[PDB]
Amino acid sequence: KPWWEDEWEVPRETLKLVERLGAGQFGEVWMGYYNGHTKVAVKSLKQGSMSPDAFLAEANLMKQLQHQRLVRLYAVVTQEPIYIITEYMENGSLVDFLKTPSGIKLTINKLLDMAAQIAEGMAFIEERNYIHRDLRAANILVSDTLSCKIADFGLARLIEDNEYTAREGAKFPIKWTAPEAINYGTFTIKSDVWSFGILLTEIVTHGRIPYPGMTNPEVIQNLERGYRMVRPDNCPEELYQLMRLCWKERPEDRPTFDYLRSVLEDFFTAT
Numbered sequence: 450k451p452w453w454e455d456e457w458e459v460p461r462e463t464l465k466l467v468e469r470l471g472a473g474q475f476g477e478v479w480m481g482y483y484n485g486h487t488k489v490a491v492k493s494l495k496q497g498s499m500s501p502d503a504f505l506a507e508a509n510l511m512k513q514l515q516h517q518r519l520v521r522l523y524a525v526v527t528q529e530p531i532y533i534i535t536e537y538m539e540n541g542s543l544v545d546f547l548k549t550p551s552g553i554k555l556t557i558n559k560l561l562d563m564a565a566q567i568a569e570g571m572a573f574i575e576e577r578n579y580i581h582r583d584l585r586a587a588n589i590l591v592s593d594t595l596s597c598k599i600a601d602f603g604l605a606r607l608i609e610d611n612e613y614t615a616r617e618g619a620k621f622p623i624k625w626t627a628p629e630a631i632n633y634g635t636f637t638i639k640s641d642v643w644s645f646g647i648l649l650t651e652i653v654t655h656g657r658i659p660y661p662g663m664t665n666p667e668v669i670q671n672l673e674r675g676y677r678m679v680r681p682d683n684c685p686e687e688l689y690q691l692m693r694l695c696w697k698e699r700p701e702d703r704p705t706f707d708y709l710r711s712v713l714e715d716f717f718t719a720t
């Protein structure tokens with residue numbers, strides 16, 4: 450729909466940018482208000498840093514994935530500078546939150562709860578025929594009520610035929626990315642399942658970098674030998690075995706996100 454018909458379009462006037470939360474190569478993230486009373490996050494595009502088409506493609510994709518477990522698109526302003534306005538998550542990113550004093554006092558019981566909420570969001574994405582491609586604790590946001598939601602849908606893609614193949618030159622974070630995607634550019638929901646395994650390590654270690662004290666070439670090499678990430682300190686063995694399922698050699702052997710959800714809920718009502 451054109452801007453004058455789009456229900457997500459709002460006049461820039463409805464928005465007040467209050468607190469700058471981040472700034473990068475491609476623009477800024479703010480805490481702001483919509484119509485005076487409603488707290489929102491506002492992401493702004495720095496002109497010329499990147500295509501306005503590429504920027505807005507994130508919003509158009511969030512028009513197709515609306516669920517409680519996923520950061521919701523609130524609105525767009527499609528005139529320069531371009532704004533994407535989303536659901537505000539008061540506790541910021543999972544990776545930062547688990548390091549704060551509140552984050553530090555969480556029981557293993559609440560961590561497993563939070564892991565099940567994330568699996569539940571990814572079960573929606575899986576069922577809708579999408580992939581995320583960037584699933585990691587930096588991209589799970591936490592609310593004021595300590596509930597979690599999937600965020601940052603910049604790399605998210607609809608799958609018609611099973612695979613999305615990346616370009617020959619494209620680079621992805623070696624520690625969070627499934628081998629087949631790093632190696633062949635091929636992504637599937639089963640690649641996100643591999644990422645979820647890594648994300649489980651970050652939950653149980655309060656946001657520590659995966660594969661403690663290894664470089665990327667060491668990680669790739671260990672994996673090819675059949676090794677997997679060393680048992681993180683104070684990791685229940687049940688959860689460690691759930692991570693191993695996510696890291697099965699063959700994509701098709703890795704579990705569904707709905708299986709991961711149900712196992713995690715069992716782990717949690719048992720603690």
Ligand SMILES: COc1ccc2oc(C(=O)c3ccc(Cl)cc3)cc2c1
Nearest residue numbers: 470490492535536537538539540541
């Ligand atoms: C300064 O730390 C914080 C605290 C709270 C915070 O909330 C957010 C968000 O809600 C958010 C929402 C959507 C995007 Cl695309 C990026 C960030 C970012 C953020 C950063």
